Amino acid sequence: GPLGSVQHVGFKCDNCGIEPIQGVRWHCQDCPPEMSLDFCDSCSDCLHETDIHKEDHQLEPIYR
């Protein structure tokens, strides 16, 4: 069943560039919907920043 198995077809990571994140998605809470940034179960701890993406925020874990 769920947890550690979640498939997010349509959400490739920004940290490592992996296709459609597996296990749990990490939806950026403060970065805008136009960007809609994402991290893997490991990458969500990486605390990354771009031109828009910053460490000023938090991420949301998605178990489904």
């Binding site: 077809v9 349509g10 959400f11 490739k12 990571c13 459609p20 940034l37 994402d38």
Partner: peptide, 8 residues
């Protein structure tokens, strides 16, 4: 990154 496709 939202690669998620949708209708026009």
């Amino acid at each position: 990154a939202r690669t998620k496709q949708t209708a026009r």
